[PDB]
Amino acid sequence: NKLHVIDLHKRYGGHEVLKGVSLQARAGDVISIIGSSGSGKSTFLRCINFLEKPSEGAIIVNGQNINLVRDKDGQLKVADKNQLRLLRTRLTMVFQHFNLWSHMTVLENVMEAPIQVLGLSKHDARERALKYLAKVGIDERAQGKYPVHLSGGQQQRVSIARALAMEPDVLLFDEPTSALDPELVGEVLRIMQQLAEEGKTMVVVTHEMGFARHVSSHVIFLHQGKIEEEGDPEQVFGNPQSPRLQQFLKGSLKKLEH
Amino acid sequence: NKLHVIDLHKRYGGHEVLKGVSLQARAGDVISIIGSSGSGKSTFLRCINFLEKPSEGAIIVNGQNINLVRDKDGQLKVADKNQLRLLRTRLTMVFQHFNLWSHMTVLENVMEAPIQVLGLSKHDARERALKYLAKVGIDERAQGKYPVHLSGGQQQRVSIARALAMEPDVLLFDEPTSALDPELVGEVLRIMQQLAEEGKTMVVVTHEMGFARHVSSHVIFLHQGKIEEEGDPEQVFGNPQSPRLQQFLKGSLKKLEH
Numbered sequence: 472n473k474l475h476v477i478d479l480h481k482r483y484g485g486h487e488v489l490k491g492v493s494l495q496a497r498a499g500d501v502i503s504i505i506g507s508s509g510s511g512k513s514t515f516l517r518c519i520n521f522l523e524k525p526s527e528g529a530i531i532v533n534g535q536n537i538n539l540v541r542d543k544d545g546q547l548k549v550a551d552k553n554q555l556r557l558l559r560t561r562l563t564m565v566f567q568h569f570n571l572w573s574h575m576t577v578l579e580n581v582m583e584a585p586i587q588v589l590g591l592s593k594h595d596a597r598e599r600a601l602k603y604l605a606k607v608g609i610d611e612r613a614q615g616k617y618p619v620h621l622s623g624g625q626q627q628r629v630s631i632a633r634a635l636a637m638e639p640d641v642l643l644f645d646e647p648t649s650a651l652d653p654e655l656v657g658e659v660l661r662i663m664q665q666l667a668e669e670g671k672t673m674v675v676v677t678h679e680m681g682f683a684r685h686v687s688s689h690v691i692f693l694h695q696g697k698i699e700e701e702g703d704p705e706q707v708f709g710n711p712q713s714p715r716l717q718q719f720l721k722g723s724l725k726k727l728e729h
Numbered sequence: 730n731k732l733h734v735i736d737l738h739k740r741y742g743g744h745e746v747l748k749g750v751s752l753q754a755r756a757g758d759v760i761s762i763i764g765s766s767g768s769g770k771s772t773f774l775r776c777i778n779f780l781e782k783p784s785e786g787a788i789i790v791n792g793q794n795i796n797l798v799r800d801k802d803g804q805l806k807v808a809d810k811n812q813l814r815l816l817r818t819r820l821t822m823v824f825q826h827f828n829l830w831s832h833m834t835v836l837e838n839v840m841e842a843p844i845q846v847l848g849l850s851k852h853d854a855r856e857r858a859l860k861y862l863a864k865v866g867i868d869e870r871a872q873g874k875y876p877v878h879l880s881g882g883q884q885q886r887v888s889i890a891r892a893l894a895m896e897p898d899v900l901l902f903d904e905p906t907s908a909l910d911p912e913l914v915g916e917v918l919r920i921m922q923q924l925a926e927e928g929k930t931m932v933v934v935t936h937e938m939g940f941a942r943h944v945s946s947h948v949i950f951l952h953q954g955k956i957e958e959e960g961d962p963e964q965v966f967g968n969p970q971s972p973r974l975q976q977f978l979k980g981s982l983k984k985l986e987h
């Protein structure tokens with residue numbers, strides 16, 4: 472379907488972090504990945520778009536394999552540059568940090584990649600940027616401001632609009648609400664829920680079990696670099712089988728994120 | 730001064746390994762012990778804190794003798810338990826292996842002995858743990874992770890922070906970089922150099938002659954259980970007298986540690 476990640480491993484030097492994980496997202500799937508800090512969730516997402524290099528595995532986007540070749544360092548690299556670019560355009564990522572260009576206004580930040588990477592006219596890029604900024608609740612008065620002027624919550628909403636304006640096949644999110652004021656978490660989770668309700672294909676790493684249970688079509692529990700349990704949210708959360716998953720669900724209640 | 734080890738011998742059963750070695754560390758001394766694998770370096774360090782039992786010798790800490798008595802097995806044991814404990818608190822050790830509690834987070838691992846052994850309040854132990862974890866470059870994001878989540882290099886940095894948090898009189902290190910990825914060795918040697926520059930009293934066994942020559946105030950060449958040559962690093966390395974030391978320095982270049 473849209474994304475198929477097969478038998479992915481990843482090492483940093485000699486330290487193996489991901490030990491064989493797979494994921495398959497079909498159109499409209501909303502996959503939440505949960506697990507302890509250190510289980511390798513961020514490494515998993517960063518390998519999907521090659522921000523990090525896998526040591527083993529395959530990545531297929533829209534049914535087309537992304538050719539990989541073993542590099543100098545013994546890791547896997549994307550053979551063809553266009554497959555890497557094509558890639559970063561069909562999959563977009565929203566991170567814990569906001570990742571906006573400090574010298575560009577909110578509007579310019581959302582217009583930039585559609586122009587520079589997709590080759591769109593300024594008019595077409597502006598129309599997408601206005602559409603998606605409205606969707607995330609960033610109004611005209613805020614559009615001429617710069618990142619330094621905005622709260623973390625506002626910057627993350629702008630980052631979500633930036634990802635949406637690329638009109639990708641899959642949206643990847645790595646704990647997007649983790650650095651936000653706790654009072655602002657709900658609002659961002661609701662924007663992500665609205666995208667899911669509109670049929671977007673999404674992969675989300677999160678500590679907010681409310682979103683993982685309530686919005687996901689599939690939940691993956693990552694444990695020490697492997698998928699220890701996965702399935703429908705009602706099963707994973709309501710009828711956990713693995714003692715490791717049961718312990719994670721109990722312990723997570725007391726951790727303060729925030 | 731801080732530690733005086735006198736005429737130490739050690740046998741495993743009938744096999745005599747250490748055959749009369751002495752060491753004296755005054756405040757701020759940085760003593761590196763070098764020699765072939767099998768010369769008895771680890772046995773020497775493990776006797777200092779009684780992880781191994783000497784067959785002959787005396788150990789004096791801060792000018793106070795640790796009373797020893799000949800045991801059932803014919804080896805020497807520390808007579809008084811408090812002298813043994815007091816001991817393990819004034820001297821701390823960092824090993825080739827990391828020695829962290831698998832069920833405790835990084836932060837909990839560094840706080841544990843100051844609470845349990847020293848009797849500190851949780852607050853005082855946490856303040857020491859945050860201080861020393863920062864010193865070894867382990868940030869907040871890594872502090873809530875468990876040993877299984879970390880590379881060897883990270884685990885060793887945490888182990889160094891654990892030793893430092895006891896605020897001991899002498900830090901003992903047995904080849905702390907030997908099991909680390911070669912790319913990570915330098916960084917750990919630099920942390921050890923920073924401790925030396927801050928005036929810490931240290932005894933270090935190592936195959937990294939760069940540290941032994943560049944950072945030590947005194948170098949001991951151990952050969953078949955005895956000190957064959959010792960002195961200032963510029964003399965031991967730049968003007969070796971013993972043909973055994975000369976042969977060790979030449980042969981060591983080709984050994985691969987990795």
Ligand SMILES: Nc1ncnc2c1ncn2[C@@H]1O[C@H](COP(=O)(O)OP(=O)(O)OP(=O)(O)O)[C@@H](O)[C@H]1O
Pocket residue numbers: 483486488507508509510511512513514515870874878879880883
């Ligand atoms: N840049 C890096 N260099 C070396 N090792 C890294 C790096 N980033 C991550 N790691 C290793 O991968 C494991 C960590 O990260 P990941 O970032 O995959 O964790 P998570 O499970 O997503 O946790 P969190 O996001 O809470 O840190 C770490 O514990 C560390 O050993």
Ligand SMILES: Nc1ncnc2c1ncn2[C@@H]1O[C@H](COP(=O)(O)OP(=O)(O)OP(=O)(O)O)[C@@H](O)[C@H]1O
Pocket residue numbers: 741744746765766767768769770771772773
């Ligand atoms: N647990 C043990 N039981 C019996 N003999 C031991 C034990 N540990 C060490 N020895 C003896 O002491 C000599 C070894 O160790 P030591 O561990 O002192 O060596 P080193 O010189 O520190 O070398 P390396 O660390 O490279 O092994 C060995 O060759 C062995 O004969």
Ligand SMILES: [Cl-]
Pocket residue numbers: none
């Ligand atoms: Cl301003």
Ligand SMILES: [Cl-]
Pocket residue numbers: 622623624625650651652655
């Ligand atoms: Cl915020």
Ligand SMILES: [Cl-]
Pocket residue numbers: 645646647648649676677678679
């Ligand atoms: Cl989140």
Ligand SMILES: [Cl-]
Pocket residue numbers: 506507509510693694695696
């Ligand atoms: Cl885990």
Ligand SMILES: [Cl-]
Pocket residue numbers: 485880881882883908909910913
């Ligand atoms: Cl390592």
Ligand SMILES: [Cl-]
Pocket residue numbers: 903904905906907934935936937
């Ligand atoms: Cl070393």
